[PDB]
Design a protein around this ligand. Structure first.
Ligand SMILES: C[C@H](N[C@@H](c1cccc2nc(O)c(O)nc12)P(=O)(O)O)c1ccc(Br)cc1
Lengths: 283, 284
């Protein structure tokens, strides 16, 4: 162990990281899963909790397995419990980013978006999945992407588009900063979560849903009837990717970068995308 | 720090345009179709082997100017002497291997930064530092309209003959891609007989029915098909890749270069560049 056995943090977010109960009779994770620990809270108004053994699988877990084998490290995987991907509150980071910044985890593996703010305090690997701010609509609805003037200036069009995102995350923050009119216009159409947004689109109560490209591509691939579609990838706004976060100056970063680029070049990443992300809807 | 960087680039529309200077040695003042001033830099290079000042502009030159302004460095730009992007080749059956193209100039010190549609891959990342991607794209296939192939798995590609000629650019990332995998060795054996010195020559050969399929970067090929409606792409993307700024591993600029690119994706600067230079209408 010692310096080759790494604390690694992740975040439940299917299909990238899927969390399952462990068999209580055997207490061993089998099939394609790996052990992952979760600090489960005693109740909703307490800091008290207890570690629970779980099992983890998914697209990011298979990346972790490949990196473990290729870069030659072992790990103790745990699920973040305070926050999600990473937000700065009172100059203190939470989520996966916080675990890395304050040196509780050597890396964070999950659906963690590379951005400027986070890159000031952690190092990111090369992106291992492309994403960005994309748009989903019901097939037949005509728009290009976030910068379409049907979004920037909706009252130039009749009837005006109804479009929204899931509030209080990075999507709303980005739109707030870049497109002030669009942002205040869409608050009325905020969606509580992705599943609610899909229903709103399918039932004609919403015309477009602005959200993460990787999530939207995955949902579009699985849609009953293949009626929900995304914009073309050339129109994704603020193109970036999910990446592994490491501590500043990490000794692991070069090896991890070269390994991910080797996986991409050898087709191994394509195999994982077909395994976990590509759905029946081919267009 | 010297603070004055030698930038190497390459002709590659719509990322880098290269035009003659005016008689007085300056660059003609132009505006884009949407009304923005076209920022032009003097770039020295071959033009046919003397080197002559020329005028460079485009997506990558706009990015260079943004980077230089943000980090407060000065620069001089030149075009890569051998005209190539860069692959690693054995020297005279020695032990030694050497990079050609922009890779070779960056590693030798003839350049301090590559600002070009330079594909990020493992092979190059072993030796240089890449920024985070400033453009996400992939590989596709250009043919003359009316040519019918399914894409990279078409039998006329996977079972090659001299009756259907396909190729890429020599000493490029796409050359590396097909040489990397033993599964692709039969395809590579065909392409190595036909690979072109530059993208522009390969594209012209497709128009002229001397090259039947050209395998290349989608950000370039989709642009070309958007201007030349006798050309079309086929097969969507069969591989995804990004372009990055290239620096030696000791560059003091590498962290701030990546931070600037990330900031520029997030605040719409990259969207402005993509709309100005890269995007276009479908033919009809
Ligand atoms: C599109 C993405 N934001 C959403 C999102 C959806 C899915 C996975 C996400 N992972 C993150 O690390 C992250 O910050 N956001 C993710 P959300 O935060 O609005 O729910 C997003 C938009 C702009 C920037 Br900058 C970064 C992320």
């Amino acid at each position: 162990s010692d310096d080759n056995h790494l604390s690694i943090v992740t975040l439940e977010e299917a299909p990238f990281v899927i969390v399952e109960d462990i068999d209580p009779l055997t207490e061993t994770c089998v099939r394609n899963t790996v052990p992952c620990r979760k600090f489960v809270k005693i109740n909703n108004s307490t800091n008290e909790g207890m570690n629970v053994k779980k099992c983890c699988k998914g697209f990011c877990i298979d990346i972790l397995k490949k990196l473990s084998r290729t870069v030659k490290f072992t790990y103790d995987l745990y699920l973040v419990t305070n926050g999600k991907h990473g937000k700065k509150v009172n100059n203190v980071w939470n989520g996966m980013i916080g675990e890395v910044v304050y040196q509780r985890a050597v890396m964070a593996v999950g659906s963690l978006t590379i951005n400027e703010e986070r890159s000031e305090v952690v190092d990111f690997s090369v992106p291992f999945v492309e994403t960005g701010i994309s748009v989903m609509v019901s097939r037949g609805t005509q728009v290009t992407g976030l910068s379409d003037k049907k979004f920037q200036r909706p009252h130039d069009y009749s009837p005006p588009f109804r479009f929204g995102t899931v509030p209080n995350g990075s999507t709303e923050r980005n739109i707030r900063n870049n497109y002030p009119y669009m942002h205040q216009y869409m608050t009325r159409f905020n969606q509580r979560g992705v599943e609610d947004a899909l229903v709103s689109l399918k039932t004609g109560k919403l015309d477009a849903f602005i959200y993460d490209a990787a999530v939207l591509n995955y949902k579009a691939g699985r849609d009953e009837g293949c009626k929900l579609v995304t914009i073309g990838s050339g129109y994704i706004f603020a193109t970036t990717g999910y990446g592994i976060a490491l501590q500043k100056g990490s000794p692991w970063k070069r090896q991890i970068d070269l390994a991910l680029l080797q996986f991409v070049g050898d087709g191994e990443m394509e195999e994982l995308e077909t395994l976990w992300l590509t759905g029946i809807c081919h267009n | 720090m010297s603070t004055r960087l030698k930038i190497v680039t390459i002709h590659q529309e719509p990322f880098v345009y290269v035009k003659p200077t005016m008689s007085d040695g300056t660059c003609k003042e132009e505006f884009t179709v949407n009304g923005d001033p076209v920022k032009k830099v003097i770039c020295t290079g071959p033009n046919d082997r003397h080197t002559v000042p020329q005028c460079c502009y485009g997506f990558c030159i706009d990015l260079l100017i943004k980077l230089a302004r943000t980090m407060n460095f000065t620069y001089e730009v030149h075009l890569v002497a051998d005209g190539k992007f860069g692959t690693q080749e054995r020297v005279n059956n020695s032990n030694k291997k050497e990079w050609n193209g922009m890779m070779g100039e960056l590693l030798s010190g003839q350049a301090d930064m590559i600002v070009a549609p330079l594909t990020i891959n493992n092979e190059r990342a072993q030796y240089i530092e890449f920024s985070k991607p400033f453009k996400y794209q992939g590989l596709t296939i250009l043919v003359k309209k009316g040519t019918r192939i399914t894409g990279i798995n078409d039998p006329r590609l996977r079972n090659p003959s001299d009756k259907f000629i396909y190729a890429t650019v020599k000493q490029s990332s796409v050359d590396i891609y097909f040489r990397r995998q033993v599964e692709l060795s039969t395809m590579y054996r065909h392409m190595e007989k036909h690979n072109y010195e530059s993208a522009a020559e390969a594209i012209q050969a497709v128009r002229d029915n001397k090259l039947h399929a050209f395998i290349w970067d989608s950000a370039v090929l989709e642009f070309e098909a958007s201007q030349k409606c006798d050309l079309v792409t086929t097969g969507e993307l069969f591989f995804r890749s990004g372009f990055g700024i290239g620096m030696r591993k000791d560059s003091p600029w590498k962290q701030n270069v990546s931070l600037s690119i990330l900031k520029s994706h997030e605040n719409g600067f990259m969207e402005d560049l993509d709309k100005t230079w890269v995007r276009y209408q479908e033919c009809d």
